Design a protein around this ligand. Sequence first.
Ligand SMILES: Cc1ncc(COP(=O)(O)O)c(CN[C@H](C(=O)O)[C@@H](C)O)c1O
Ligand SMILES: Cc1ncc(COP(=O)(O)O)c(CN[C@H](C(=O)O)[C@@H](C)O)c1O
Ligand SMILES: Cc1ncc(COP(=O)(O)O)c(CNCC(=O)O)c1O
Ligand SMILES: Cc1ncc(COP(=O)(O)O)c(CNCC(=O)O)c1O
Ligand SMILES: [Cl-]
Ligand SMILES: [Mg+2]
Ligand SMILES: [Mg+2]
Ligand SMILES: [Mg+2]
Ligand SMILES: [Mg+2]
Ligand SMILES: [Mg+2]
Ligand SMILES: [Mg+2]
Lengths: 332, 332, 332, 332
Amino acid sequence: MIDLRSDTVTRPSRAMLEAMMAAPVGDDVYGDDPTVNALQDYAAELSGKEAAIFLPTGTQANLVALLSHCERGEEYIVGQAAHNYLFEAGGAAVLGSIQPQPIDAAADGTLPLDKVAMKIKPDDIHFARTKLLSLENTHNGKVLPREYLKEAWEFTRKRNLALHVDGARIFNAVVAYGCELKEITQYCDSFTICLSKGLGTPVGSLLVGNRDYIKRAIRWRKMTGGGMRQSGILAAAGMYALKNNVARLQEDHDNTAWMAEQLREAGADVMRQDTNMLFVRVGEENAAALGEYMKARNVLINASPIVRLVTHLDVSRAQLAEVAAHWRAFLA
Amino acid sequence: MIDLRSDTVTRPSRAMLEAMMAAPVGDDVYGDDPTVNALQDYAAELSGKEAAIFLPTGTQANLVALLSHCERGEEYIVGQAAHNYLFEAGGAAVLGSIQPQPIDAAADGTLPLDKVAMKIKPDDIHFARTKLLSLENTHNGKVLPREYLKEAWEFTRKRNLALHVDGARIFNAVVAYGCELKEITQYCDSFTICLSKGLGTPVGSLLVGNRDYIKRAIRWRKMTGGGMRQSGILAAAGMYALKNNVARLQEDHDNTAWMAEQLREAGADVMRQDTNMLFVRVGEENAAALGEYMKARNVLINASPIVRLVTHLDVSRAQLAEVAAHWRAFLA
Amino acid sequence: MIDLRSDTVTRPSRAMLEAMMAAPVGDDVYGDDPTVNALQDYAAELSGKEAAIFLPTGTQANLVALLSHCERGEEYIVGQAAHNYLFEAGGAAVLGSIQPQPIDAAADGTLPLDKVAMKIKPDDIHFARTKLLSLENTHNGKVLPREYLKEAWEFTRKRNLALHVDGARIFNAVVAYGCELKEITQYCDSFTICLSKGLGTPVGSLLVGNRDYIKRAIRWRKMTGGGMRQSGILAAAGMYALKNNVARLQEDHDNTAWMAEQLREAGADVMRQDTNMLFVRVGEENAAALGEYMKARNVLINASPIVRLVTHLDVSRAQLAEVAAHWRAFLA
Amino acid sequence: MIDLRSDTVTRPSRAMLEAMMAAPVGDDVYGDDPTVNALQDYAAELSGKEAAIFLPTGTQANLVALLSHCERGEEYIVGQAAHNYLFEAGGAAVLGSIQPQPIDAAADGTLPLDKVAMKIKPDDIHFARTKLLSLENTHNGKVLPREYLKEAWEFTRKRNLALHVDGARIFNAVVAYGCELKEITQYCDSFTICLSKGLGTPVGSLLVGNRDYIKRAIRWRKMTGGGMRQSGILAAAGMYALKNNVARLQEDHDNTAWMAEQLREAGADVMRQDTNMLFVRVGEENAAALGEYMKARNVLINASPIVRLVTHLDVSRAQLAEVAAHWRAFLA
Ligand SMILES: Cc1ncc(COP(=O)(O)O)c(CN[C@H](C(=O)O)[C@@H](C)O)c1O
Ligand SMILES: Cc1ncc(COP(=O)(O)O)c(CN[C@H](C(=O)O)[C@@H](C)O)c1O
Ligand SMILES: Cc1ncc(COP(=O)(O)O)c(CNCC(=O)O)c1O
Ligand SMILES: Cc1ncc(COP(=O)(O)O)c(CNCC(=O)O)c1O
Ligand SMILES: [Cl-]
Ligand SMILES: [Mg+2]
Ligand SMILES: [Mg+2]
Ligand SMILES: [Mg+2]
Ligand SMILES: [Mg+2]
Ligand SMILES: [Mg+2]
Ligand SMILES: [Mg+2]
């Protein structure tokens, strides 16, 4: 089975499973789970932050981050296509009583600061109270320019606004920058880390930030339903992932870069390629046809006019070759 | 005094006050105020709708309108600069648990239906549930083209979306169209009518729609705090205004077109004139100074880079001539 | 028409109407309404508080007070039968994301402090965060003992909790205590005043408290839809009420005390009498019969097994005699 | 170590861990995890319901259950000491916009139906809309009488209310009843099953109900953050527990009855013993001291005036004998 629908489908390696089954555990609600604590301390330390908290999903990581930053009536400036505005079902507004102020991202994935500036509300009773700027790195595989990350950080300080980064795929960006995680997380107040995508974990995400901030985050995690018990079994996998699966993300990137060239030399229309993502304009007509045609040969893609292919540790290059052949044969 | 800050500054005429002091009243919570009932029946009949509800303000009329249309987790497509998104402190999301989905309006004030369609969410757990399209007529004085109004209605019927129109200045649109109110309200499920701006009432707005919709609105009005007692005294002004203050809106319109030419003559940079509003680019270097200079001559404006001047029954052409002379002196 | 359903049905006297029609007004949103400001300053001054804000209803006065005191996730201890828990449709929870912790009041109308104490939550992530204690004076005509008001005040300071008093009928209690308003409002951080009940106003209520508190209240009043324009027309009536209708509440009380004795000597079962309220156990059977039987002779009561009769300025004693006759005749 | 803090402290048996490491997984968001699907199908079939949904915690299971049953402005009748009212940080109201209506449970843990009926709100705009009755089985170890369960169900059908049962320890009730699960679940619309307490799972709870109800729950799970990926590894433990850890709950029960007698012998004041819980009145003068003394001997308890001791598969009778000896030494 060749699954290119997303990097969320990565399954645990035997080594990861072993680390999981041998991890000492405790009751996380009581703060007695050794492995959970260890994962959190390690993440805080690696990012230059004071604390971190483990969550069941990146969606809850963001929901909690937003609740922790914004009180009732406050607002967050975010992307119209950002995950914590568009793909978390309006959670920040629906459950958190937070006003979202979405704006279109530039082609490079950043939120134009001149545009963010026009959305910062005056301190007048007619408006929501602007409090947070939220970013997303990577954004649809897009690695945000580092100069912008720094400028966004400077700008938010000037405007007394906090800055959050949805880092579901932050390690993909890190590998692509060729720098240390800390050199990019210094430009935010808080950020998330998904362990269940390219890092290969079964479940789990982390929210990282200032001690006091994280303390509030614990309150919100409890209310939203993410305060688990012996979650050390899951956190164990995250530690294994962070110590063994970061560098090979480069293989996912090289594989995507390779596949783009393949599909290219196969009649396919590759719109763009970034880190572990490739976007192909298949078109309305062949969209559903291609979907079934692939699934028939154990190749899974989220069929659509513009298909998003995502590489990861459970897809090898030979497997990409075979999918490339099938795609080159489909065009007949 | 000469007030061009907004049309909300209108004060009761002598005739309106008499109607008020002479109106029969009752407890509106019990549904026993003859004047509120009469006002609501008249507005309903005048617009071709089943029912109407009187509220303390247009803000509450919209908040209640949004709550009546969208249940928790649902979403409304609306303008980035629309009043019930930008100027009501994010009430729909904060208090209502509704996801707002703003988009930029086109220059004529409409929300391009191609963009609205791009925002309708698929029925998938990752998204909010698109339920309503909210419009604004007039929008900063701009009158929406009638063809678009019919187009939006048809568009929403086809896509099973409700259509709400914030009609704070809908009679300014009606007068400008040269048609009957009902000829434009047939293109919406619900709409609001502000009585306290150009129509000259001291307080009050109305929400109009079908009987079932309004019955839900009544519950939301109570909860949000608009369930008043002897509001008949306030409703009486509304009735006086709808019967005696609608046609004269043409005077305000003529006065704004006139003032626009007077200022153009004076050297001011008039950006645009639409119904009872005209926009002047004063610029940052003169913003505050113009505000003080005018305030000195007993002319009140909302100083700002781009000054919005609003006309109404409490500002005459002669007074506008004086303002144009002061402005003229200011520039040179 | 003899209306005993509530004191909310009081209509404006000619003098009140005159004060209303002659009051100088402004735009309250801009803070330019002279009469609104005057009503607020006078109320703050009379109660020893720093500021006050005028609202369309007592319901919005409480909704706003609760929002101003409690942030998302905080909690207020209140009565199971208190108006801002039971009769405002769950507004504090529904719109404000505030957890209500209701408890049964004692027979005297107070919230037993030993009981309030057991409901104050530990600072643990499993619980809502206790922040406010809310009272109600009068509570179903019941005048709360002054010693308790003082003890409740002392207790909340010891527990670092704010204290709010729903004073819809605070002047009835004031008259019954025979003291100055300030001697009872010193035992709370904020309180409300309804002008539209025994005080005789058509619409309106006031929220009073600390400057900073009230400033937040202005934000919430705007969002909830209570920020009106020329509301000086309404506030004028409140000033007239506060300067002319406070002392005669004693007449309502004497009238209630008189009627109790009458209905008593008529076969009626008077359960209790407090200030301007009388409660009669009519029973399931005669409940609906009595309702229609009265309405037939222009006597309006909220028919029920236990009828609540409320006296006020629009009911004279002769009128109570006539209703007493009808009730004594109904028992045949 | 000897942990009597709660049954949530249970750690995976050797057999459970093997089942976990050997379970086939998939992406649960896509509905492709065979083990989650199997767990959900098994629970549904075992309880006579149409569907089930796996969640990270019982808190989320209840939050989602409440959201699925009550729309905004609706209300649930629930116990003042019930977990989804008292111990979930007011989530239903704070995040869900649902009015909670708590009432004291009777000594046997049921909510007296006469009191529940007194709380059903009339259909009037002043009230929240009563929608759900929530129950707790077991409640602090107390098993609800089966006659009451049938009585509540019948009561809610007659009054058109849905019935939810928080079944964190429902198998403790089942074992105590000596009947099949389905014989008690027929008396509710929905119920939860906690897998991480007495059943010995590291994490996880289940919400069970009809297909339509569960489909709405799936949306709320996503929004609140419980939409995990390869949760099959966690679901596998749940399946192992339901098939191998239910009958032994009787051992925990016997151990608690035994420990209660051991402590009575030692001079402790045993308030009550119900299933796997026993309550000891330690008193304020000895609360903290007992906590330290025990913690010294490697026995963990939740020190407090009234200490709640909870038994489970990780505490044997021999260990309970040691605790009884330490306690005995403590007292004299
Ligand atoms: C299009 C529109 N809709 C709704 C409202 C709310 O009505 P209110 O709550 O009674 O004020 C206004 C108010 N117009 C003001 C104005 O243009 O002067 C603006 C500052 O809020 C408005 O222009
Ligand atoms: C009756 C009941 N319902 C729901 C829950 C929520 O389940 P969780 O979110 O997985 O913890 C608990 C937890 N029981 C804990 C206990 O008894 O030790 C209590 C502190 O929260 C419970 O006892
Ligand atoms: C940028 C981003 N942020 C947050 C999340 C939330 O994570 P959970 O799905 O674990 O809740 C995702 C999920 N990613 C979906 C995909 O790209 O396939 C994501 O891509
Ligand atoms: C104690 C109390 N508090 C607040 C309110 C809210 O006021 P509005 O109705 O103006 O929103 C009322 C209304 N009183 C209802 C009655 O006794 O008839 C009340 O009695
Ligand atoms: Cl809803
Ligand atoms: Mg994975
Ligand atoms: Mg909300
Ligand atoms: Mg006006
Ligand atoms: Mg009145
Ligand atoms: Mg809420
Ligand atoms: Mg466990």
